[PDB]
Amino acid sequence: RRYDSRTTIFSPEGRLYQVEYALESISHAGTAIGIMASDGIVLAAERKVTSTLLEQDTSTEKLYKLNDKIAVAVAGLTADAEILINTARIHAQNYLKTYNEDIPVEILVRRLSDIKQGYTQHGGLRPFGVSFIYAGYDDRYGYQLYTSNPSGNYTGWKAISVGANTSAAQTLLQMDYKDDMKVDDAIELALKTLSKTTDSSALTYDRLEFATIRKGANDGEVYQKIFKPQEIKDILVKTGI
Amino acid sequence: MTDRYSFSLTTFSPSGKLGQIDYALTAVKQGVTSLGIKATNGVVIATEKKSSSPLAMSETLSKVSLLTPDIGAVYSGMGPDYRVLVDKSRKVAHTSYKRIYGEYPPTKLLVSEVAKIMQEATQSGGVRPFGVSLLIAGHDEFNGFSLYQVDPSGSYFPWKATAIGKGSVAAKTFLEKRWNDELELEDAIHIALLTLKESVEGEFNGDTIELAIIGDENPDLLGYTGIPTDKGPRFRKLTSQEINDRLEA
Amino acid sequence: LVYNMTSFEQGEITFDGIGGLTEQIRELREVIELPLKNPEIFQRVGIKPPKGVLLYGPPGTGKTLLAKAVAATIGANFIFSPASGIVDKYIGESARIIREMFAYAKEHEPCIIFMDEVDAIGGRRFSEGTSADREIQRTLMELLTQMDGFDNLGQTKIIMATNRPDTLDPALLRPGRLDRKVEIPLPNEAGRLEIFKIHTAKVKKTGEFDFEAAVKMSDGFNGADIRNCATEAGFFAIRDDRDHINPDDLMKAVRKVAEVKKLE
Amino acid sequence: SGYDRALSIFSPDGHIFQVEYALEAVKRGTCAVGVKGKNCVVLGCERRSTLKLQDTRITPSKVSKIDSHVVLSFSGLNADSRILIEKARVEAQSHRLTLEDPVTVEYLTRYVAGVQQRYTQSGGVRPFGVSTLIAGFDPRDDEPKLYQTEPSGIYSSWSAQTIGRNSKTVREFLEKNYDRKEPPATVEECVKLTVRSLLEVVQTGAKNIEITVVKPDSDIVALSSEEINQYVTQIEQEKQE
Amino acid sequence: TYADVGGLDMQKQEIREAVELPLVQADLYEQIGIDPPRGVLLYGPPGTGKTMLVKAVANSTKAAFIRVNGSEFVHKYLGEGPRMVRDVFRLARENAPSIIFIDEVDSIATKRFDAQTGSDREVQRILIELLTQMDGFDQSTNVKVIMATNRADTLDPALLRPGRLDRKIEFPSLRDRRERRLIFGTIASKMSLAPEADLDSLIIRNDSLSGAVIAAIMQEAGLRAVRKNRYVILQSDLEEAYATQVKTDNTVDKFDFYK
Amino acid sequence: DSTYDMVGGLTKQIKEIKEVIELPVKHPELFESLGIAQPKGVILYGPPGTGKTLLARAVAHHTDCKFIRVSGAELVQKYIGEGSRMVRELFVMAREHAPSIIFMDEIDSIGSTRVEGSGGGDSEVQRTMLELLNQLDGFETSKNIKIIMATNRLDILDPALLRPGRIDRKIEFPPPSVAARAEILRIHSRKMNLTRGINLRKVAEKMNGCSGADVKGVCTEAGMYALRERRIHVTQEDFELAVGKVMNKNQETAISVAKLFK
Amino acid sequence: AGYDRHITIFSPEGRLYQVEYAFKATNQTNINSLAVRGKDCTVVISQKKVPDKLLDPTTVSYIFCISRTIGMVVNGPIPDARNAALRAKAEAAEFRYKYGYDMPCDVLAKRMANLSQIYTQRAYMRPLGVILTFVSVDEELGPSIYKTDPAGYYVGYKATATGPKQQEITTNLENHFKKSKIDHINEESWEKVVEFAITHMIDALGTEFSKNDLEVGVATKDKFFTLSAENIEERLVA
């Protein structure tokens, strides 16, 4: 008798073996990276498959969007990931029409995480196996960068990653990072990690996508830029793969 | 040689995968072949049929079905988990998008709805998924043509040219060797047949298959003429006599 | 001897002193007797003689009395290997027994097998205990290679009796051998008196005849029914120490003992 | 056996299992100490110094106030701790609403335990893998008090207590030093009492700690990182040899 | 034999040089200076004609030869399996130069999962009886192995590398018309058939076939006619036969199972 | 037998083996002067086709001690309670020759982790060699005996085996770097022929880290693409031909489009 | 091992087992019926077995005239059949009252089969162990047969059969259609089509019959109905 058949059971060792068996699911997923720096936040991606007769060109997979301010990166299951963002895109607007202003990023994840806890105990139901990254900007705290975990606990990081072989990629980030980077120090950094801890030697433009947040709006709020292929195949050759 | 975790679908193994959705797909293979190709002006879909008793009027059943005048579909897998799926689908095209946006959906906001019909199966235990995997073809004024796929796990891809069922790996190998990124329509039909030649048994005529296409307007189908912009469909399936002659080449 | 009777090739039970069939038994006349009689043609065509047969259907048909009987006509050694009585819980030692008999059959010059209840081999594998079901094919698969390897003999024939055909669908083992698969009958009402004529013989009974017997034999169409009715109808003329049967005991017998032969 | 894979059955010894297995989970968490002087309360924490990529702009915080005269501290796991903190602060501001009167601390403490009793009794539910404690002052009085809570759903009133790693070292320690024969008076000895109490676990890391105290008249005050760094030294100043 | 085999125009070549050529011509391998290979492997679905090719090689080897199908290894009393396996390879090197055949190993050659049993744990160390012999401290230059399997994608990679299986070979599928025309001409020509010879009417069909089904149809067609009190020839009305070789219709689980 | 010139591919590992083996035998006086311990046998894990067994046949060629072998599962036996007897009658044969290395190629057949539902005599004879290495009389046996075992993946086993006190080092044999892969070509090629205007590093850098033994397969096979044509000598393009081929099929079944995730 | 005592579990090879048991649980009656079209009509026969001698034979019937212009002949045990025939006698109120006109047969099979599909996704009910055959005379497409099943694979056969003697009847029927190369049958008179049917099937399996051992259904336009022992000698009269 071992304690895994249901997620409503502590172990005698004091642990919930089903939840660990969800936090391991993301290891099957694809890499995701974010960096926080001076001018604005950046993100990366890596599609799990990069075959021929399916277009990942116009069809974004790892980089959805939640508002003109906030954008995320996603991992894990796909059917249990859309409904989260299709809840987040609601909760924000249901914070706007009542309070007539934008969302603080901390409240969203605080409200998006504590439902995953809801799918951890009350009922014999699956916990949503997903490890989002949150990227956005609020005034009471400036730039921001959070991270989730299908348990329901978050963390405000500076620059981290998830997915396949992040444990090594962190080591390629822990020691070769500088807070005073503007943007492109993080870029050649970011794209250098994925180049190191991949599965195959392609690194084709289809295999990965980027994104950005920027406060370049001159006293306007913020801009985004989710790069088409023509903006990222030109930069890696402009960076020296 | 699997045990203790395919029993249900709400217990992640230590390896970190769900139980029997992986095994639903095992039937999807064991169903008949299928395919669909994206041209620069149209999209095609095709399946055979190994009608068990020849006495059956094979015309009655239809692998292909309607969703809109502009969108059509086909499976490769279990049958009776299709003919209900479509009514559960086109019912959503009306109540979801149409009656609160006036006109018919694009393809992806009609495919995303299909998924939410699917994932509601894999939510609890002792309630199985659908033993099928679909592909959808349509057109719009925003981005035009598209060819998507749908799996029982809720996921939905796009594609450019594909096959599924038995002749899946063999066909998709041939398509990579008999495809171009800037071809035309009619040669696509000249492919799908000889692609469908790959894993065929019995006959090959126009009676023992059913394939459809989409393309330019076909206002002869309309019947409600007298209006400038009340334009007709972009969907029609080809008659056996319209196919049995094309086969002659 | 150790295992089985082997019939000394001559113990001559009557394959025709029986209310069975003529078509099937003549269908078997082809695959066995014709080559062993007449090799001048299979030689002339060069086709090798046939590889075994299946005889489906549930009991009462006499699907084992004909077998050793026709074997007695040609004169081969008749033995058993009931798969229910061949399985052993150990990992091997279900396949060893297979290996003994193909060898030991060849220790004798001719020999033919009668497997029965062979569904124990051909299981659906619905449990899927890989510690077991990985071995179930292991012993089964050994049969497939032990049976037709280098054996170019015309003496070692094979039979497999299998009630419940098509319960096996792990493998139907169709292609190649099983050159026949006889469409077995049941005892038709016409065959009743064809059968009752068999066992009634060797009796002094004032006849004991009737047409009220197939109606009694209706739905009790199994050979044990007739063997036993003639048994117990024989035990009722002695129930009063009489001298010869009356046919009412037959009309009493089958009516009053096919009961167990229709309810359980 | 099999008597321990549910919440609605008794072993033949009479005791349920899934609850006190929670007490094995909470043992795997960080320290949380509390002491009351004559007129001021304190609270501690075994904060971690994990890595140089969490934003120093936002340190984490075990502690979380619910109203200006009550606080709360815990240990165990954070997700299931986030809920009842929000069901608490909600419940307090309701008591101000309905009754035009703040909350007696005992009333609050029986609401958090009033949920830890149902979330084990009615099955279809997992408990809250957390122990907590309450700290503060009643309105219109200086009466100090702290209460403990645990997932069995019972509320006690210790004067000093801890929860988690090597608590067994500490709950015996303060018994050897703290005592009602001489109740402390003000902050600098309640803190000089406490900062030394942590030392069984802290292994000499001062980037691994935070602290708070309590006011009458519905106030609080947090504390700095140098304002302990001296207290790191007076406590070591006695440790000359 | 070789000439009894049909369309193995490619596969027939690789083994009759990986087996025969060395013992007849090895000085030229080392005339470069390399070590030749030791093991091969023959993986393709059943009926594709693998187990019979070695039997052709058996007729023409002028070496020794050993037949052990994979089920023969196991017994109930543990420990005896491997010594039987050790008894093999010592017998080989004794009667050298020799080679070995196995007709199935998928009951053995597997992935070596994490076992928790005796059964699944004792099968593994049988496999270890091979590995420590095929490459350990004690090896030789006379043995070669002819493995076999109906399919090869699961047996562990530690068995699949050079030194062990330097040259493994594929087999065709069941839908490749060229050899199909070559088989009917082969098998039929070995005996006497009709002038009305509609065999260029059967090849063209889209159906998939083996080398095993062909032995069935052409035999059981030779059955129906010889059954007709006839003497030699097989009538062009064997249309019963081809359609009699439709076993998919005889599978209710392929008729009324999934739906 | 083979030798140390042939096990090229590394030096850091092999320079750690006789750190424990050759020194105590020849020179324990410093180590008795320093007088601290006596480091006993060693384990070496790595994926297959990497040179594990190869180093162990070489070392016997370069040892001066007696070198006992047990191949895969020649200790597990039919009757009961003599597998142990087959063990304790081993070491007593060692101590006759006080300097005595032993070798056992693989342990995952024997020393797998224990359970009760199955696994009998094997989980017993492991439970006495585990005694012999570090027991009372094992302290006697602990004097001069040294041990080498070469698994493939060690998470399977107990810790008690690889527990220190008897296993003081746990060596990794990973798949190599470019120059390591590059040299062993020559170690499997120098016999070949006056290879004509050739490079071999430009091809190793093509084939990323696969294994070592595979490289013995390309070289022997490359000559074979030259052996057919009576072309005794060797080509360049035959190499990047073969190495580009024999790993393709290894990259053939790795694909899958299940994709229930992202 | 599981996989069999539950419906909604796939085997690893794809095929589930529980419905396949119900596909097999139809023929516990040892009954075999037959249907065949006409030129404007359609007929259905049915073998009978009333061995015990205390059953009023008039009421034993695997026929249920659900409404006008519809018919149905069942296999599987009788009680499940009533539990299906009821739902048919319920919808034909609704489709009339809700959409205006009478149900065609094809919809009525399509609708009914979706219901038995829904009991292969959840444990509301078990699946009925029936396989049933509707007949009618359509106002647009003409006569029609449809062959339902438990899981829900319905199709329209030109003239089909059922029972444990399908292979046999599957043999001789199609032999008939290829002697003329037509799907339906000529010779309008629904009476005379019975004489075609019964003689086509006695010789099939080889047993002569009485009048008190069959039951028949006839599908003319404007009505469907059943008949007693009239016209029980013309098959032998000539």
Ligand SMILES: Nc1ncnc2c1ncn2[C@@H]1O[C@H](COP(=O)(O)OP(=O)(O)OP(=O)(O)O)[C@@H](O)[C@H]1O
């Ligand atoms: N670096 C190397 N130097 C010399 N030979 C090598 C090297 N790498 C591989 N080989 C070759 O690979 C084979 C050795 O394989 P290896 O010893 O790695 O497997 P193994 O340890 O014997 O497997 P196991 O012991 O688990 O059965 C020999 O033929 C050897 O020539």
Ligand SMILES: Nc1ncnc2c1ncn2[C@@H]1O[C@H](COP(=O)(O)OP(=O)(O)O)[C@@H](O)[C@H]1O
């Ligand atoms: N056709 C038959 N005619 C007369 N007796 C028969 C016939 N078939 C079976 N029997 C009787 O039944 C017995 C054979 O039982 P059988 O049905 O062969 O068992 P099984 O089917 O298990 O081999 C014989 O002893 C014989 O008396």
Ligand SMILES: Nc1ncnc2c1ncn2[C@@H]1O[C@H](COP(=O)(O)OP(=O)(O)O)[C@@H](O)[C@H]1O
């Ligand atoms: N080219 C061929 N010509 C004639 N018979 C063939 C041919 N190929 C295969 N066969 C038949 O197929 C059988 C071999 O089946 P096979 O696939 O070797 O099974 P396995 O490999 O499991 O032993 C032989 O008995 C032989 O009759």
